[PDB]
Write a protein that binds this ligand. Structure first.
Ligand SMILES: CN1CCN(C(=O)N2C[C@H](CN)C[C@H](C(=O)Nc3ccc(Cl)c(F)c3)C2)CC1
Ligand SMILES: *[C@@H]1O[C@H](CO)[C@@H](O)[C@H](O)[C@H]1NC(C)=O
Ligand SMILES: *[C@@H]1O[C@H](CO)[C@@H](O)[C@H](O)[C@H]1NC(C)=O
Ligand SMILES: *[C@@H]1O[C@H](CO)[C@@H](O)[C@H](O)[C@H]1NC(C)=O
Ligand SMILES: *[C@@H]1O[C@H](CO)[C@@H](O)[C@H](O)[C@H]1NC(C)=O
Ligand SMILES: *[C@@H]1O[C@H](CO)[C@@H](O)[C@H](O)[C@H]1NC(C)=O
Ligand SMILES: *[C@@H]1O[C@H](CO)[C@@H](O)[C@H](O)[C@H]1NC(C)=O
Ligand SMILES: *[C@@H]1O[C@H](CO)[C@@H](O)[C@H](O)[C@H]1NC(C)=O
Ligand SMILES: *[C@@H]1O[C@H](CO)[C@@H](O)[C@H](O)[C@H]1NC(C)=O
Ligand SMILES: *[C@@H]1O[C@H](CO)[C@@H](O)[C@H](O)[C@H]1NC(C)=O
Ligand SMILES: *[C@@H]1O[C@H](CO)[C@@H](O)[C@H](O)[C@H]1NC(C)=O
Ligand SMILES: *[C@@H]1O[C@H](CO)[C@@H](O)[C@H](O)[C@H]1NC(C)=O
Ligand SMILES: *[C@@H]1O[C@H](CO)[C@@H](O)[C@H](O)[C@H]1NC(C)=O
Length: 340
């Protein structure tokens, strides 16, 4: 019953249905094992551990998989990679991320912080031990984190160094905000997302107050990104295979804290993407026919605070994204690998 921080090679578990053609099911059928049918965590009594979500290998462990997963599934007609043009087959596929678990091999375990207000760094008091993590959907997105877990109590602000403006801030919402995005049946690339103005605005209000506590009640200001390539300037995600690019100016720019209706963001489905796995562009074919719809829960926000504001009374925050390791860090933050 003693251990030390260490890294090893993990394996995955998921409930992939062997028959299903959906790319995540297929990727998990041949690369992951069946989920533990008999899990049991082991509370360690009055044991206090330290965690660090910004420096956790599990996150790089998951990243590598999703990159492998996307490489063998979601695959472009043409891939441009620093002066190369590999052409390929690019058939429309079935895409809907499932949860995947991360388990340790014999000789190690994962420590799971259960402080409902854990921020991801430092000390944790109620510490549990698990063999595998819970089911995590590997949802790829910028600006908004969708379909994830929620914070159990207060909205949590996660960062490696709040004081360093270069380090990303992950907001962990305690209440989700539904976001419905549709590309109507037959511009075929035109689409949009609908969001409750009231709900979203109340949540953003609350978020503002949280950041207030972390930044000496200094005026909090939200704005959209200042410069970017579209993947970052817009809220980007994949819905049923298609890459959606939505303009979130109406969430971070009306402030509005008579505005309380249904926010409607304009989006566009882009065949040509700047990849997240590695630098390069990938070009897909045009969209599939019929209404393409994905309703998702917004569960977190990726923010970047402005710099050089030290001499003012304001703090400016803009939605960020691009590095997916932060998206995985969004769910894995409470886990840590220790060798027995
Ligand atoms: C650093 N590391 C290595 C290479 N990367 C880049 O160069 N990126 C820059 C690029 C614009 N310049 C945006 C990229 C991005 O996020 N693409 C993206 C694609 C599809 C979806 Cl669905 C999505 F949500 C996002 C991030 C990845 C990060
Ligand atoms: C510690 O977390 C575990 C996980 O559910 C649970 O027993 C309870 O929330 C906490 N226990 C105590 C004694 O606080
Ligand atoms: C969410 O957390 C905030 C604190 O940031 C709190 O005021 C609010 O009541 C919480 N709401 C829910 C639904 O948990
Ligand atoms: C996280 O919590 C620890 C301990 O309470 C604290 O030292 C650290 O500053 C916190 N980080 C943030 C971003 O709140
Ligand atoms: C946090 O950022 C500030 C500003 O760059 C820096 O001076 C400080 O050393 C950072 N904290 C740590 C622990 O490095
Ligand atoms: C989502 O949007 C479409 C089109 O506006 C609508 O038909 C549907 O009822 C909305 N809600 C859900 C849960 O799909
Ligand atoms: C938006 O959510 C609020 C609760 O915050 C609710 O009163 C209202 O019915 C919702 N709006 C719509 C159009 O469903
Ligand atoms: C922020 O303002 C609130 C006012 O409700 C006050 O109670 C609190 O002490 C202030 N905190 C800081 C860090 O300025
Ligand atoms: C998003 O829409 C607003 C208008 O609502 C526009 O000013 C802005 O340029 C758009 N964003 C981008 C990156 O084009
Ligand atoms: C929103 O901010 C953007 C700056 O990127 C700009 O289009 C616009 O002036 C702002 N909104 C309003 C209502 O002025
Ligand atoms: C979120 O989950 C819903 C229900 O499982 C799904 O229909 C939707 O496609 C998911 N969103 C994304 C972006 O994958
Ligand atoms: C969206 O949120 C509701 C309530 O927070 C939850 O019951 C539901 O499972 C969430 N959807 C997904 C796809 O996780
Ligand atoms: C802004 O303030 C932080 C901490 O107060 C400091 O670490 C950082 O270097 C400052 N930035 C500039 C440009 O002075």
């Amino acid at each position: 019953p003693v251990w030390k921080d260490a890294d090893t090679t993990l394996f995955c578990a998921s409930d992939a249905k062997a028959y299903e053609t959906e790319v995540h099911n297929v990727w998990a059928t041949h690369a992951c094992v069946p989920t533990d049918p008999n899990p049991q965590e082991i509370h360690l009594e009055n044991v206090t551990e330290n965690f660090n979500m910004w420096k956790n290998n599990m996150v790089e462990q998951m990243h590598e998989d999703i990159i492998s997963l996307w490489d063998q599934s979601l695959q472009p007609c043409v891939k441009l990679t620093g002066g190369s043009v590999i052409k390929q087959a690019c058939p429309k596929i079935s895409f809907d991320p499932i949860p995947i678990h991360y388990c340790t091999p014999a000789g190690y375990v994962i420590l799971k912080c259960n402080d409902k207000n854990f921020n991801g760094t430092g000390p944790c008091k109620n510490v549990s031990s698990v063999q595998c993590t819970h089911g995590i959907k590997p949802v790829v997105s910028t600006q908004l984190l969708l379909n994830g877990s929620l914070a159990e109590e207060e909205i949590i602000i996660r960062s490696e160094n709040l004081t360093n403006n270069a380090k990303t801030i992950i907001v962990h919402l305690n209440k989700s905000v539904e976001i419905n995005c549709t590309r109507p049946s037959n511009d075929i690339r035109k689409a949009y997302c609908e969001i409750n103005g009231t709900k979203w605005n109340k949540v953003l209000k609350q978020v503002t107050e949280k950041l207030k506590e972390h930044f000496n009640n200094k005026t909090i200001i939200f704005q959209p990104p200042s410069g970017g390539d579209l993947e970052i300037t817009m809220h980007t995600f994949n819905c049923r295979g298609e890459f959606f690019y939505c303009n979130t100016t109406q969430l971070f720019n009306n402030t509005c804290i008579g505005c309380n209706g249904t926010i409607t963001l304009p989006c566009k489905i882009k065949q040509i993407i700047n990849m997240w796995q590695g630098t390069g562009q990938a070009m897909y074919a045009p969209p599939i026919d019929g209404k393409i719809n994905c309703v998702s829960n917004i569960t977190g926000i990726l923010l970047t605070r402005d710099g050089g504001a030290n001499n003012t009374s304001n703090e400016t925050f803009r939605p960020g994204g691009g590095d997916m390791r932060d998206n995985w860090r969004s769910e894995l933050y409470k886990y840590k690998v220790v060798q027995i």
